[PDB]
Amino acid sequence: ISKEVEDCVPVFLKHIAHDIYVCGKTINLLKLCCPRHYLCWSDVPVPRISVEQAYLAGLAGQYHLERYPDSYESMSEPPIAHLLRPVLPRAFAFPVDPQVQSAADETAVQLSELLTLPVLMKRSITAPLAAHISLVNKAAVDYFFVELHLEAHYEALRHFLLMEDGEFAQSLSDLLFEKLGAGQTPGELLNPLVLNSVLSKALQCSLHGDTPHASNLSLALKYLPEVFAPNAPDVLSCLELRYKVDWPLNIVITEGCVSKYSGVFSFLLQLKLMMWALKDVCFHLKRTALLSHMAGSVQFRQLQLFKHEMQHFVKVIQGYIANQILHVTWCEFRARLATVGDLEEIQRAHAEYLHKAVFRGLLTEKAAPVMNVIHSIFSLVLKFRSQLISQAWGPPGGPRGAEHPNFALMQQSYNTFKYYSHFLFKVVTKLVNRGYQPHLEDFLLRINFNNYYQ
Amino acid sequence: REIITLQLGQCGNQIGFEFWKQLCAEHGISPEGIVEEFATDRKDVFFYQADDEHYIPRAVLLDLEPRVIHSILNSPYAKLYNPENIYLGNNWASGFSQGEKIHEDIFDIIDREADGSDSLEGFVLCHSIAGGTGSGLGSYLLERLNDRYPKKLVQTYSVFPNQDEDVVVQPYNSLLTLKRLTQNADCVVVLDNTALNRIATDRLHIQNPSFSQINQLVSTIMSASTTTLRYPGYMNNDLIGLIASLIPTPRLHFLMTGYTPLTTDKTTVLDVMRRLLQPKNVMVSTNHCYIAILNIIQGEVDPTQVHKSLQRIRERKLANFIPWGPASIQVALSRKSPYLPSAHRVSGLMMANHTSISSLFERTCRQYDKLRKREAFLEQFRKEDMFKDNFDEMDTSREIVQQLIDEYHAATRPDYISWG
Amino acid sequence: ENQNVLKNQEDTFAAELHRLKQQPLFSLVDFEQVVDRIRSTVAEHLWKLMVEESDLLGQLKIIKDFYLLGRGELFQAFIDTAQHMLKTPPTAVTEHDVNVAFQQSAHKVLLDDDNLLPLLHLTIEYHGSGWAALGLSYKVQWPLHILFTPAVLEKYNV
């Protein structure tokens, strides 16, 4: 803004030190991209140099449905193009009117005591520049937004990378999970072919839709696994969804920015992973189905419950993140997206659409402790539920704990999970009092809705 | 996977007829079964897709000695439901025996749809308890489905009948149905004729035509209970995830119903949530406590309100529960449809596991116990005696339902960790 | 002037001052006349903005409603619910404990509306009878900052 540290307060005032720099790069970018009707290089005009009952009910519904496009005409109102031009001759003629009085009054100001006003008042003469600046920013926004339909790119990235669309998220994770747990554990599930095959399969079977937007979707990996570990945790499996960006929005969406988007996919997937086996263990108890209903086992009843308690905690955790990010922060970003009116402004809305989602995610580094307890909790749930699957029931007579005789070991595990739960009840509070983490108030609020502990 | 609804019995066929009609207007559908021109939702589960967009519901309509049954056929929506799968006493035994001779053709009609669908996740029965033909036939079909299709999960929209207590054998018929339902239902959603009749008297002056008007009330609950499945969501998209939270122990699988707008014909979430916890909005008629509660709200809800709202209901404690299960109320949100009116755009429903429903089960068990001693209505009809000479299934049912009555109250106690 | 990111009488006034310069001998009355003409124009314009654009009547209602115990039901209840906590002696963690009690007291009256609460909190000081260190603080908007320098709120605190 200052030449070295030598800023010209006389000409820049340090005010247009930055504005001049911005307008220059934006006109050069839009024009660089292509002549647009509103500007089209020097096409801008005379800018002063200055410086059935169901069917009738259906028709009522048709009008209600048609009301939404009438409301959506307002969304599509900004790129008029033909009316944009009239504003400009009027728009630059309007400055001429101040510019008309200013020159004459400049003679009066010059006549009065050399300068009637302070020497610094000369900033009034350079003021018209702002007019060009306004036109530049507004124009860029339409090209960047309606012409390039940017919101849709954010909307799809949210849908597939943050897994908002429910069907797509469950299937891509589902096929992979069967394979990851089943075998092929030495990166035989990393065959580029299987990865691509599942991705296309996931995208096609999502049913939210097949679109030009679905393009640029890629299934990929970064760190290479030597082998998948016990419980097939893929606790950090480096499967990176990669999203290509077009030249203009390549500037709008920075590589570091999509680097952050990947993180949620990771944790969310692991949550889904946790979810998978549990549904399955209940399905496995339903696989036994006590099919020998002829024999009703007392121990069965007991375990039938241990599964539910561990299941109850993980359903709450997946719920907590969802409201915090899926409907609590995208709504905020959309209001900011509507508000942003300039390239720099657009960069900071998406920037905090994510700096915030990450903060509410708890993946933030300062919040490591809660994530750490989660790991211990999540590890126990994965490994111990896997044990009941390993064993098989036994002869039907009297009390029969021996059905899956390893059951005894699991009870010890049931108590370890509980120990962490109580600890987590104490951990969230330990942090809330020391500083301000308004987000964590929501965490604890849900964890113990009814008791010191459940 | 797509859901197949086995609507059976005259009463059950009446609420399936309306439920499908309710999703006809709510979804982009027409009486012919083709989509409307004016028409982002997940119609795959509930509606089969024909080649020319004839979205035909996967409804299985079972009829027995049909006379008023023909009324469903003489309707503008006769074309809408054309899987071409409809196949031809007031006693539970009379219904069970009739079902057994025709079991294989009705079961092949189940197979056809199962083969036709990409997949089949659950069988949702519009069951009528003590429904004359509807009960007995419904219990038998409940027993066959689990054996053949163990992998799938069953639900029952049981319209438990309470009319202030005509059927003189009503308690006996109901007693037998529950023993099967407890044993062979993965889930059951309970409704009450009197509870809804009391609501009808409350919201409206309608008293004498209680059955016709109450059909709309049962429907609004039924469409609403599956709206999260029918419309796209970030969570509980699958039926199973939803079912797990509502039923924490297998035996206690009966679910209570409520609607925040007793009259739906702005409101903040903090308000809509509080209405579910008032008993005037509930539709079901020693300490007692809920086992776990869930709620689904509809429309463009303001979200920040919910954090305030969820922490808000907590201070209010309007819902009192301390069961063996953890029991946090769960908050869900969905989109109100873009065809139907936006009047009362925000509108909610709650599905909850409550030990109070045990009392309704004990009242029919009370009528039956009184009736059993008198033996006033043993029927002794040759069908009844020949089918059941020992009459010991009623006693087998009595011990199984008493175990259920006992289990519920055990849930109220501090030690359901021990056997219940 | 700053915080922008108002009527232009500057010239008229510049002409006024310019004429003042031309006059040969100092006449305090004319200087006084022109200066107060301007002073008068700034205060009137300034008063309209703050009084209407940012209604002050409400702000004061809030200041008396809390600093001055103008809210009887809530303050009485706050004293009632947190009796023991405030009674016990001060330390570093009692501060959140009183505030959640003061928020708990806010919904205890049940007379609430959006926001209102965000602009108030309780401030306990320890190591320099908790009732002894209980201080109430308000968050002032920029326009009202001059009118409510900490000194006036500091006297209000007592």
Ligand SMILES: Nc1nc2c(ncn2[C@@H]2O[C@H](COP(=O)(O)OP(=O)(O)O)[C@@H](O)[C@H]2O)c(=O)[nH]1
């Ligand atoms: N909710 C509701 N229940 C009905 C309706 N009509 C009959 N019922 C119930 O159906 C039960 C008797 O079944 P019924 O009509 O005898 O079956 P049927 O043997 O096929 O005639 C009673 O318990 C009634 O409560 C209706 O329109 N709505």
